[PDB]
Design a protein around this ligand. Structure first.
Ligand SMILES: [Zn+2]
Lengths: 195, 533, 113, 188, 224, 258, 171
């Protein structure tokens, strides 16, 4: 029946939601199901052809008052349920991409419409981040500031690097005593640990 | 009289006050245990020693007397933290004291806490002991009660409310009981002196320590070593136990799904099977099909359609061992079998009984036979029912039963018996000196593509998740090929029992891709691989 | 001792309320009385435990957790119900002192047990 | 956009942040009274006009900032003493349904001051650490009795601390919402 | 007006915005004044730095503490705008609406809402709706078998704490009646059940949102 | 801890039969039919006729209970939530007031039969229902010190009664029950029937009555108040004479007792 | 009950028994035969998103809904005897959603009373297992295999809250 493919597709949305929720660090949303979506759209095209043929028979006068009305109505419901399934799946993957855009601001699994969508949303984020309200780093940390000064140990040999506060030389397994407001970005990037 | 109160007070204050850093660990444990209706506490000896060594000294001198006092202290603390009724709580201990080997326990250790280890070899059924017990007095019909505790009692004779010499009886209608179990511990195999059979002990546990272990497991035990009545002035020893020590994730199935969409998965799985063996491509393909299997079906009129696969092989020793290793469930045997049951089953004798061979035992899994020609006479006829029906039925000497034989058979040898198998092939050899030299070098090394475990888990996943169906195009293709071969043979046999085998091979081939429908791609490879000859 | 009587009264109320069990008593009695004048059905009745739950929870849990104190008085009440209903006169010597009361049985929704 | 675990609730870090804005009494060891602090979210006069060993009142986060070094000492709140906690435990036992009238931030402030200011108390700390535990356990019993009255309409609570409410929030609200959904569906 | 009072108002707005189900109106004036103050304080810190260490430490960490709250607040509001985009657009399109969208949202929020709606519309319109028949091509359809527009759950349960009138004018508040021998109180009617409750000053409650919306707007209660 | 927060005729009869028995205390209201009047009166009359017949045959309380109890479900139901049954019972009693207030013999016979029916129905109650019904009627227990001072005499008085009436053959059981039993003090003239049988202890003109006895006081109060109401009902029989359609029914009802 | 909610999308696909009240041409594909009519008093199992409409639209509507097995009398008695021990996961994965949908459809009064008691009684043991934090696996695991998909979310969001508070405190 016409809803089986949608019932199969939505299970992938539930699966990827649970996989994403289990581990926030391991976000790689799986392959876009091009084939199942194509099959669903082909089914919708078949139903459209059936409705058009039924309209031709209605214009021919083939008991069109009762027979065409009920058959057309039942077909319309079948199309609407497929629309709901497709929109739900795409909306879930859109939400995951929106979550990733805020932190970042690789591509192979995304469909090309989604590939341009992510670029558009990154442009929107940097537009908000610029201009007025620039003084607060909207993409910054959401954990309240606990301490000014911390001790951080050097995890990866990135060599000498530049930062707005100054310059660091990340000699492997050396330790700094430095203010957190400087090294917050480098901790997020993963060069440093708090010990 | 006062000493019983001071000791209880001391242990009560122990539970209420022991912090390590910032958490009252035992108050938290005792609260968290009650919420899941677990009435016990797991104390650690080292913390008790750290808190106050005198309490540990008292506990070490006279365990049998002092353990109940600490238990009732646990109850008194348990009521405060949860009530503005509960049973008596069980104390459980952990320790790191030096293990005594089981062979060295002797008269110096009676009524001492002992830590030992071994292998559990037997387990009794559960039995009932009394804790609170009510009493009726026969003459005057007065009533009273008694509280038992299980440490090393009989009904009293001080009649009350003359009242007689032995007037008391039990009201089981208003009494409380607990569980009890017996176990046997055998000394460790790598500790026995040479040329002797291993020594063993018997032991007891109750309440939450019951039903915690099974036969054959190596364990560590903490318990009181004591004696009981059962020569002159001689008694048997035993131990009272106080402590014992002994489906897919999402990230797993993601790897299996990535493998499923590989365009060359069939080649990869064939290459991964017995990689040392040179050549023999179709043998490896057939073993893949045997491992994966078809799809079971049940019809409205009750007829039942088989899923298993059967293969025969006419170097060959290695492949059966590999199949044993890779398969989720596997049994290995030679043609004569492990007993007089042979392969299938037999009746033996004194009253008669029945036992099954290595076809009943492998039910639900795979079975591999090392030399099919050494099959016994009864098995030669019984394997017909074992393979066609997946059952074995016997009516002999008053026995009348039927046995399940749901399994896939692999076999090798070196006649009409070949008809039972879905595919038959003959092993082939090649004699490259480099191969032998490499094998010899590896042998000297020990003397001086997908891995097995991953492949086994993948096979399990595919068996659990999918069971595909034929498409109509495959049906037309197969029927046309069937009538074509029968007509060709007529003008110059194929039968329905082989068409239904080709269908199973087709389904097993479609199973690898996790495609819900089988297709002409699979039908072509099925008939291509059908060339046993 | 006094609690025994009240439980008999409460089960009598139950037997009067749910009338389908009176019909069972009477049908067994009249069937046995008919063929006696010429097989015999037992003096046993099966009650639905759900009816007893919906009638009185305290009696239901009493039956299901303390059977030794609740099953006997209910059986006594059933025997009283069957005895008060009309019966054949002039019983024989064996019938006069048979020591044979009616007996109960249960069905439905045991839950955890 | 916002993380999933912050859609409906405050994390304990935010609860600590909220509590830190309260005032607290201190003894400074240095005189600042005649640069100046020039704060923008608080009063600035108190810090600019400090005199050594003269009691004064400042926000808690600056107080902990000073106490990190030698320049300050923190006076404990008056409720955080053995006599008062004894009386509150007796109140808890006496009235088996009402909650005792402790301040809304008692757990958070106790577990901040025991870490940052262990040396400034008058009572022995190892007794306070026990009496706090007693109070929390009794309150947990009273909470566990209360969850049998979740209903379709409302509930009343009194003197329940902020952290205790935040601990329970997602359970109470969810179960109450589903009971509301079941009830209103029959009306419609 | 003072710098001390603005931060208390900011904390109030942040806490209320986190819990309530609907999108509350933007404080237009407070944000202007706060952001100007942040800029001036940053320049002052730079000037004093270029000119005892401890006062500078206090000033720096205070500015960090101030910026964090605003960051969290704006992120929460944008998250709400994501979920009710079609609802807000429908509210704006209604000519008879009692409130305009620009009253509710800030200018940056207006920009975000508009352009994000267009981006999301372009994604689904080409992918899915390009293939549907003309009867089902609408994205914000109300008439279908399932409503395509989401909106707030006005009956969500929320914790509250009763403050009373902010000025302490218990004698002036017209709604604030009095219970027997005790504190003043408010009264509210819950209409599905046809029942009343008395909300005494100082006591905590779990209450439906719509029943207490008006008192929340008047600052008679505060969300916990 | 957590915390949340005509019709009048039907309510009147629900109140009147909450206790499951009534002294028939209050004026009925609303309407019923004349067929209902006749039939309800005849049903109660049949039950009371059988009660008087059994008493004339000198049958015991248990025999009368065995005879009369099956008739409630047919004629005059008892222990019932039905408004119809409750109204039937109440109205039938009130009708037989007007039938049997006419003469001293009729008043005595009606009081005797109705009081015995009251006794029968009271026996059918549970002890909780009996306690609630007695308490609803606004009906002096002795102090523990007075019980202790008179304990020997009271126990000597009631010990035989405990054995025979409450089946407490064991003296131990009798002692425990007596320890748990309460006693009532009142003038001896109020319980004189128990005095004549020496079932109560007398001291200074007061009779000491255990709690498990004393139902005769309740039934005697019922009989006395019913007699006074019947005397009152007799005095305003001229107002009954305004409706001629009722007098043949009452004459028919009274004819079975004459 | 949002549009894009996955669980609501998935719950609507469960099938319910149905019976027809008119013969209709060409709709035999519901009976898995596109080339034939449907006939009156035929019985079929249809998904809820379709049966919810065909039961309403006219007069006599096209389809009548038969009482499904998941709301049978045996289930109700099992609920009312011991709600805590009940294996609702085996009965139906989405019980409390379909219950509310059915109550809305038919405006049942007694079923609501039963379901409210069931939810309230199971929430107690759910909170008990939520509160119990290690400083055990089998005792918790036996009960948590009998939770609905609806109840698992509440359990997870309660457990994480308690765990976060404990971690912050003892730190
Ligand atoms: Zn005795």
């Amino acid at each position: 029946m016409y809803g089986d493919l949608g019932n199969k597709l939505v299970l992938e949305a539930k699966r990827t939601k649970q996989l994403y929720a289990r581990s926030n660090q391991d976000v790689n949303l799986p392959m876009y199901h091009e084939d199942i979506i194509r099959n669903i759209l082909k089914e919708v095209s078949n139903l459209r052809k059936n409705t058009e043929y039924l309209k031709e028979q209605q214009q021919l006068g083939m008991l069109d008052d009762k027979v065409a009305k009920c058959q057309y109505f039942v077909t319309l419901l079948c199309m609407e349920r497929n629309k709901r399934c497709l929109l739900a799946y795409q909306r879930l993957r859109t939400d995951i991409l929106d979550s990733m855009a805020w932190n970042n601001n690789d591509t192979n699994n995304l469909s090309h419409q989604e590939q341009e969508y992510l670029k558009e949303y990154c442009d929107l984020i940097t537009d908000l981040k610029s201009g007025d309200l620039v003084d607060i780093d909207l993409s910054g940390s959401l954990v309240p500031p606990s301490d000014v000064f911390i001790d951080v140990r050097v995890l990866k040999d990135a060599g000498e690097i530049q930062t707005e506060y100054g310059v660091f030389n990340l000699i492997k397994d050396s330790q700094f005593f430095v203010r957190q407001s400087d090294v917050e970005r480098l901790i997020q990037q993963g060069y440093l640990q708090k010990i | 009289d006062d000493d019983n109160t001071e000791i209880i007070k001391s242990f009560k204050n122990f539970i209420l006050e022991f912090r390590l850093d910032s958490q009252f660990i035992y108050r938290d444990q005792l609260r968290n245990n009650i919420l899941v209706k677990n009435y016990s506490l797991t104390v650690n000896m080292e913390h008790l020693i750290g808190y106050n060594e005198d309490i540990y000294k008292k506990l070490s001198d006279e365990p049998s007397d002092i353990i109940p006092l600490f238990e009732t202290a646990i109850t008194q603390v348990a009521k405060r933290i949860s009530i503005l009724s509960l049973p008596t709580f069980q104390l459980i201990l952990n320790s790191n004291a030096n293990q005594i080997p089981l062979r060295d326990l002797d008269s110096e250790h009676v009524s001492k806490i002992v830590r030992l280890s071994g292998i559990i070899i037997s387990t009794s059924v559960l039995s009932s002991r009394a804790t609170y017990l009510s009493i009726m007095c026969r003459n005057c019909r007065h009533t009273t009660s008694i509280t038992i505790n299980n440490f090393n009692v009989s009904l009293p004779r001080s009649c009350l409310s003359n009242c007689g010499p032995d007037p008391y009886i039990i009201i089981h209608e208003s009494s409380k009981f607990i569980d009890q179990q017996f176990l046997k511990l055998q000394e460790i195999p790598e500790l026995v002196p040479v040329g002797e059979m291993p020594r063993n002990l018997t032991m007891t546990c109750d309440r939450y320590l019951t039903n915690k272990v099974i036969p054959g497991t190596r364990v560590t035990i903490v318990g009181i070593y004591s004696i009981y009545n059962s020569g002159v002035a001689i008694r048997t020893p035993y131990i009272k136990i106080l402590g014992i020590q002994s489906m897919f994730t999402e990230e797993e199935e993601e790897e299996f799904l990535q493998l499923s969409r590989n365009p060359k998965l069939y080649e990869i799985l064939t290459n991964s099977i017995a990689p040392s063996i040179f050549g023999n491509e179709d043998i490896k393909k057939a073993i893949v099909c045997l491992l994966m299997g078809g799809s079971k079906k049940i019809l409205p009129d009750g007829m039942r359609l088989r899923g298993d696969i059967n293969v025969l092989l006419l170097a060959k020793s290695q492949l059966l061992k590999f199949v044993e290793k890779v398969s989720p469930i596997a049994v290995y045997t030679s043609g004569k079998g492990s007993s007089a049951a042979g392969l299938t089953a037999s009746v033996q004798r004194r009253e008669f009984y029945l036992e099954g061979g290595a076809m009943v035992l492998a039910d639900g899994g795979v079975v591999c036979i090392d030399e099919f020609d050494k099959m016994r006479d009864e098995d030669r006829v019984a394997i017909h029912e074992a393979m066609e029906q997946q059952t074995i039925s016997i009516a002999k000497a008053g026995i009348t039963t039927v046995l399940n034989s749901r399994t896939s058979v692999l076999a090798a040898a070196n006649t009409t018996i070949l008809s039972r198998f879905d595919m038959i092939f003959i092993v082939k050899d090649d004699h490259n000196e480099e191969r032998d030299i490499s094998i010899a070098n590896h042998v000297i090394n020990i003397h001086t593509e997908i891995s097995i475990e991953k492949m086994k888990r993948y096979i399990t996943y595919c068996r659990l998740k999918c069971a595909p169906r034929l498409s109509p195009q495959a049906a037309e293709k197969l029927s046309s090929n069937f009538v074509t071969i029968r007509k060709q043979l007529l003008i110059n046999p194929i039968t329905i029992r082989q068409l239904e085998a080709i269908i199973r091979i087709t389904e097993s081939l479609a199973k690898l891709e996790l495609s819900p429908i089988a297709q002409e791609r699979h039908v072509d490879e099925a008939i291509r691989l059908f060339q046993a000859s | 001792d006094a609690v025994f009587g009240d439980r008999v009264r409460r089960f009598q109320e139950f037997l009067d309320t749910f009338t389908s069990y009176r019909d069972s008593v009477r049908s067994i009695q009249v069937y046995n009385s008919n063929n006696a004048a010429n097989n015999i059905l037992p003096h046993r009745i099966i009650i639905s435990l759900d009816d007893l739950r919906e009638f009185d929870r305290s009696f239901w849990s009493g039956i299901l957790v303390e059977p030794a104190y609740f099953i006997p008085p209910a059986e006594k009440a059933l025997t009283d119900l069957a005895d008060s209903m009309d019966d054949v006169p002039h019983p024989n010597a064996s019938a006069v002192s048979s020591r044979h009361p009616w007996k109960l049985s249960f069905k439905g929704s045991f839950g955890a047990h | 956009s916002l993380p999933a675990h912050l859609q409906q609730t405050f994390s304990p870090e935010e609860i600590q942040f909220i509590v830190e804005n309260e005032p607290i009494k201190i003894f400074p060891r240095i005189t600042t009274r005649q640069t100046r602090w020039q704060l923008i979210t608080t009063d600035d006069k108190a810090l600019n006009n400090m005199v050594a060993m003269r009691s004064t009142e400042v926000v808690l986060w600056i107080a902990l900032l000073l106490k990190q070094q030698s320049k300050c000492s923190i006076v404990a709140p008056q409720w955080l003493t053995t006599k008062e906690l004894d009386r509150k435990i007796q109140y808890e036992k006496t009235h088996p349904d009402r909650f005792s009238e402790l301040p809304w931030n008692w757990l958070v402030l106790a577990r901040i001051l025991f870490n940052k200011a262990k040396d400034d108390f008058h009572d022995p700390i190892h007794e306070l650490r026990g009496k706090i535990q007693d109070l929390r356990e009794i309150r947990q019993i009273k909470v566990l009795k209360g969850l049998k009255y979740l209903n379709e309409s409302h509930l009343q609570l009194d003197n329940l601390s902020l952290l205790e409410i935040n601990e329970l929030r997602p359970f109470i609200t969810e179960i109450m919402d589903k009971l509301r959904e079941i009830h209103t569906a029959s009306l419609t | 007006v003072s710098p001390q009072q603005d931060f208390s108002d900011l904390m109030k707005s942040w806490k209320n915005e986190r819990c309530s189900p609907e999108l509350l109106p933007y404080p237009h004036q407070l944000m202007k004044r706060l952001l100007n103050r942040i800029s001036m304080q940053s320049q002052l810190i730079e000037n004093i730095s270029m000119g005892s260490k401890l006062p500078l430490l206090c000033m720096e960490t205070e500015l960090e503490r101030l910026k964090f709250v605003i960051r969290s607040y704006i992120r929460c509001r944008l998250s709400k705008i994501d979920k009710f985009s079609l609802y807000l657009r429908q509210l704006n399109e209604d000519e008879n609406s009692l409130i305009s969208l620009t009253d509710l949202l800030s200018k940056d929020e207006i920009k975000y809402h508009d352009t994000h709606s267009l981006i999301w519309l372009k994604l689904v319109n080409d992918s899915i709706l390009k293939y549907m028949p003309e009867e089902l091509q609408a994205i914000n359809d109300t008439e279908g078998s399932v409503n395509m527009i989401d909106e707030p759950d006005w009956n969500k349960f929320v914790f509250i704490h009763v403050n009373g009138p902010p000025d302490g004018k218990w004698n002036e508040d017209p709604l604030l009646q009095e219970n027997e021998f005790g504190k003043p109180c408010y009264t509210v009617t819950i209409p599905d059940l046809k029942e009343e409750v008395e909300l005494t000053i100082g006591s905590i409650y779990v209450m439906r949102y719509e029943v207490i919306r008006d008192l929340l707007r008047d600052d008679k209660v505060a969300l916990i | 801890m957590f915390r949340q927060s005509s019709e009048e005729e039907k309510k009147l009869y629900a109140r009147l039969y909450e206790s499951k028995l009534s002294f028939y205390d209050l004026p009925p209201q609303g309407e019923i039919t004349l067929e209902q009047f006749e039939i309800w009166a005849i049903d109660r009359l049949k039950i009371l006729l059988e009660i008087e017949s059994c008493l004339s045959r000198n049958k015991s309380i248990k025999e009368i209970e065995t005879i009369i109890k099956p008739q409630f479900q047919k004629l005059l139901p008892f222990n019932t939530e039905s408004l119809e049954d409750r109204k039937k019972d109440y109205y039938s009693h009130f009708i037989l007031r007007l039938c049997f207030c006419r003469s001293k013999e009729l008043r005595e016979k009606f009081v005797r039969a109705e009081t015995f029916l009251f006794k029968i129905r009271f026996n059918m109650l549970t002890s909780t229902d009996q306690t609630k019904f007695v308490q609803s009627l606004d009906l002096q227990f002795i102090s523990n010190e007075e019980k202790a001072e008179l304990s020997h005499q009271l126990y000597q008085t009631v010990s035989a009664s405990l054995q025979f009436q409450l089946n407490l053959n064991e003296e131990h059981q009798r002692k425990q029950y007596f320890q748990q039993e309460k006693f009532i003090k009142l003038p001896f003239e109020n319980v004189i029937e128990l005095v004549g049988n020496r079932l109560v202890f007398l001291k200074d003109g007061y009779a000491y009555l255990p709690q498990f006895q004393q139902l005769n006081l309740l039934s005697n109060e019922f009989a006395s108040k019913l007699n006074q109401e019947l005397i009152k009902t007799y005095q305003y029989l001229p107002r009954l004479n305004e409706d001629d359609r009722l007098l043949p029914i009452l004459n028919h009802l009274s004819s079975g007792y004459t | 009950m949002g549009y894009y909610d996955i669980d609501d999308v998935l719950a609507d696909g469960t099938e319910f028994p149905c019976k027809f009240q008119y013969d209709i041409p060409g709709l035999g594909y519901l009976e898995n035969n596109p080339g034939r009519p449907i006939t009156k008093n035929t019985k079929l199992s249809l998904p809820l998103w379709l049966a919810r409409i065909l039961a309403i639209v006219g007069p006599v509507p096209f389809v009548e809904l038969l009482p499904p097995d998941m709301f049978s009398t045996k289930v109700m008695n099992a609920i009312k005897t011991d709600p805590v021990a009940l294996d609702l996961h085996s009965i139906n994965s989405h019980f409390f959603s379909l219950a509310i949908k059915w109550i809305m459809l038919f405006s049942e009064k007694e079923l609501a009373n039963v379901v409210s008691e069931l939810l309230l009684q199971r929430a107690q043991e759910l909170n008990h297992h939520a509160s119990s934090l290690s400083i055990t696996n089998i005792a918790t695991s036996t009960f948590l295999l009998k939770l609905e998909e609806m109840e698992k979310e509440i359990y997870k969001k309660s457990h994480e809250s308690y765990k976060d508070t404990k971690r912050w405190m003892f730190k």
